[PDB]
Design a protein around this ligand. Structure first.
Ligand SMILES: CO[C@H]1O[C@H](Cn2cc(CNC(=O)CCC(=O)N[C@@H]3O[C@H](CO)[C@H](O)[C@H](O)[C@H]3O)nn2)[C@@H](O)[C@H](O)[C@H]1O
Ligand SMILES: CO[C@H]1O[C@H](Cn2cc(CNC(=O)CCC(=O)N[C@@H]3O[C@H](CO)[C@H](O)[C@H](O)[C@H]3O)nn2)[C@@H](O)[C@H](O)[C@H]1O
Ligand SMILES: CO[C@H]1O[C@H](Cn2cc(CNC(=O)CCC(=O)N[C@@H]3O[C@H](CO)[C@H](O)[C@H](O)[C@H]3O)nn2)[C@@H](O)[C@H](O)[C@H]1O
Ligand SMILES: CO[C@H]1O[C@H](Cn2cc(CNC(=O)CCC(=O)N[C@@H]3O[C@H](CO)[C@H](O)[C@H](O)[C@H]3O)nn2)[C@@H](O)[C@H](O)[C@H]1O
Ligand SMILES: [Ca+2]
Ligand SMILES: [Ca+2]
Ligand SMILES: [Ca+2]
Ligand SMILES: [Ca+2]
Ligand SMILES: [Mn+2]
Ligand SMILES: [Mn+2]
Ligand SMILES: [Mn+2]
Ligand SMILES: [Mn+2]
Lengths: 232, 232, 232, 232
């Protein structure tokens, strides 16, 4: 079996293992800050630099994966706490969309909300143009920020949030468990055919965005990942 | 929302949070040993002492949960390494079945392999009477040790195994990720309607068993759990 | 180490984690209402359902704990605002005293004011028979509602009160901080040997009572708790 | 009664409510970073800018207080995780000791470990020169980093730690409860006469330090405080 495994307890500016895109910075405490608080339509993304083989064209086999990460979103004086973080999977050549308006696109899609990715968004602003639910929510996205499915959630300013994600290749099920500050767990699951929506090799990472009036602190604190593809 | 959350880094005799059933002992290192290596058809089970409300007849709501645990199975001289461990959910009055033959029943079912439980088995012996697959496997069980679904797995003697389980109430999906010593992940997922198969109040725990010729060390090293039931 | 931890932001009927005794009800907003406004000598108590091992006869070790809760007492028309709430610790078999007169007993003691418990009382009526100070007070109680120590306090009708309690096992000190509506803090501390006054396994909870002409709304709004006992 | 109350969910370097001393910086996420990772013998301290009257020479009354704060200590590559954070109380003219060697002094004492302060240290290095216990520990300090009392503790890299402190003026008891990431609570309490050891007016704050080969990230995330002094 072919396995990709890594663990980040902290991050650093001169680490070849991470690809930094856009407005992302690494703070002295080791956290990744995805957006720039002084820029209009700010977009920042981080990717694990090595492409992951999620499916084999020779065997037709699809990888399963287990990943856990922690983040924090914090309000900043005078701006609307927006727009949120998305944990995404995309083709290995993925870049911030050209002429990105940031905001509700979460840095992964065009103005119409379309892109080439699979993701789990932690959305803190209700965009009517992308049929967002009225409150903060966790969503399962397939090539669109108009989520396939959402669940109500609450983004608590300054709270450390823990997420665990399981992709079971046989049932094609993406399962997500989000552990909040008040101790409650929020879950969401959806069948997503990764072999049909994504290429053979992909990149995994995080993206966040803001607008002129919607800005907040978006931090990635830690990330562990294991994927296993059967080679028989 | 109603949340039940606990974490065991170690275990102790006299800990009122754990109900011990059958041949269970607590080792000096804090590990739980489920079976007795010198007894024929040995059965040992540990339960979280408090009943957990997994669903409500008033709202029709069903809880989601996130649980992680670690175990170890180790071979002993001359006996067949058998029979394995099951992580199970059962009615609050659950007891080792009367006249239990241990063995392939894993301490949760009768001789015909029927019982009242939902579980995830780490099965190290192929019982033809229970239509077991030919190799070691992880299975999802619904009122029977004749699993609804299985996935091939390998039980490595002396290896610490990590398991993460997500139950998403909306899709009724039970997703399991098993992390082995060699770093590879094994996953299995199945739609199980806990509201249809179990009572409103249940107990969560572990069970293991052996036979005359089939015995091995079955250890529970740690267990964390969080369940959340929306109250409306 | 052996740790018991929980957090209630709200409460619900049928939550197997809480034992309801006497006249307790759960309101639609999630608050616990301890007494029944239409009953003479009303007594209601809520206990965390799982016993807590506060000390071990094997090692001689005693647990430390940290707990925070919020309550509200509100006046009702025609009756005297009485008698108050007590946060208490008692043997695991604890029940409302048989033939309880409620009133100044706070539902934890007999007519003479004696019982088997350790508690922190928020007393709103001056019972001369229990040597109460002349005004509202917070008291530390050891097997009696004739407090070992009191501090003057003011119970404001309809005000949400926040309490934090620390029990340091090494010094045997029970420290209490009460945050009033006017913003001021009230504190009280007393050395109490829980190993000498209580059994190894105990229950934690709240109790309130009224009399014929002494009745008021007694609400428990939230409760968080953590206890840790060092093990061999 | 005379009450001082404040709450910081975040901090800003351009706010007059806080005094910054030495190598302290405010990160974009709003956290306070006390030490500079690239400097030898780095010392940084933060103080609430308004002096708080803890006792009266006219009445002889002493204030009680309740304070809660959260911090994080994180390891950095190639340097020892040292030296720790101290929550301290000191005269209103308090400054980093002249020619401070940082390290085991925690930025509050001289080379011999003596200073004018009362504090609660979260010490991560065993300095034999200050009779430190062999492991990580929480200590209660009275004019010396040779603690009056200590309790074993474990500093987990990247973990958010919650602390609650109660000072009861009647018993002169300083009680501390520390909530760890593994769920366990650690407590320590000591009788400290603030009238005898400190002036009528004091400043409250935090300090941290490093050495040549002993450096780590020291962060202050939040701080709430309430003190009340009886004026009758
Ligand atoms: C209508 O213009 C008129 O006034 C303009 C003055 N103006 C207004 C604004 C602020 N409004 C806006 O930015 C509008 C766009 C908007 O609401 N985005 C959303 O902002 C969110 C946070 O609130 C989230 O981030 C969402 O994701 C994101 O979609 N900035 N400047 C003039 O310049 C213009 O000449 C004139 O004609
Ligand atoms: C066959 O009888 C004849 O010889 C007997 C002598 N014998 C044989 C045995 C051992 N066989 C057995 O125990 C048979 C049952 C068996 O295979 N269980 C499975 O053992 C596994 C480990 O290999 C797993 O644990 C499975 O889950 C479990 O089902 N023990 N004693 C006489 O006593 C009897 O008078 C006589 O007529
Ligand atoms: C004068 O007597 C004759 O007429 C009486 C008629 N009466 C009077 C009352 C009300 N007084 C009482 O209830 C007296 C007891 C009392 O003062 N409790 C305290 O009430 C507090 C609230 O004010 C707090 O709750 C304290 O904790 C609680 O101890 N109810 N009925 C008869 O009852 C009696 O048989 C008969 O001989
Ligand atoms: C033998 O000496 C000769 O070579 C030295 C060269 N040297 C050695 C070192 C490293 N040792 C040291 O730094 C020694 C001091 C020390 O152990 N502090 C503690 O370090 C901790 C982290 O491990 C914590 O921070 C504690 O709080 C802090 O007290 N750095 N430089 C010269 O400098 C010296 O002139 C010369 O004669
Ligand atoms: Ca949105
Ligand atoms: Ca089997
Ligand atoms: Ca009274
Ligand atoms: Ca030290
Ligand atoms: Mn959305
Ligand atoms: Mn099986
Ligand atoms: Mn009283
Ligand atoms: Mn020390």
């Amino acid at each position: 079996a072919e396995t990709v495994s890594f663990n980040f307890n902290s991050f650093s500016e001169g680490n070849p293992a991470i690809n930094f895109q856009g407005d992302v910075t690494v703070l002295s405490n080791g956290n990744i800050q995805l957006t720039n608080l002084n820029k209009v339509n700010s977009v920042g993304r981080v990717l694990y630099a090595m492409p992951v083989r999620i499916w084999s064209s020779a065997t037709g086999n699809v990888a399963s994966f287990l990943t856990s990460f922690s983040f924090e979103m914090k309000d900043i004086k005078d701006y609307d706490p927006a727009d949120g973080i998305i944990f995404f999977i995309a083709p290995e050549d993925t870049q911030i969309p050209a002429g990105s308006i940031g905001g509700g696109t979460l840095g992964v899609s065009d103005t119409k909300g379309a892109g080439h990715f699979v993701g789990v968004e932690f959305d803190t602003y209700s965009n009517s143009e992308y049929n967002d639910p009225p409150t903060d929510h966790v969503g399962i996205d397939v090539n669109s920020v108009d989520s396939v499915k959402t669940v109500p959630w609450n983004s608590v300013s300054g709270a450390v949030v823990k997420v665990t994600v399981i992709y079971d290749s046989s049932t094609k099920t993406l399962s997500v468990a989000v552990t909040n500050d008040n101790g409650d767990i929020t879950t969401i699951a959806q069948v997503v055919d990764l072999k049909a929506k994504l290429p053979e090799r992909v990149k995994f990472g995080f993206s966040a965005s803001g607008s002129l009036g919607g800005r907040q602190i978006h931090l990635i604190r830690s990330w562990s990942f294991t994927s296993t593809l059967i080679t028989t």
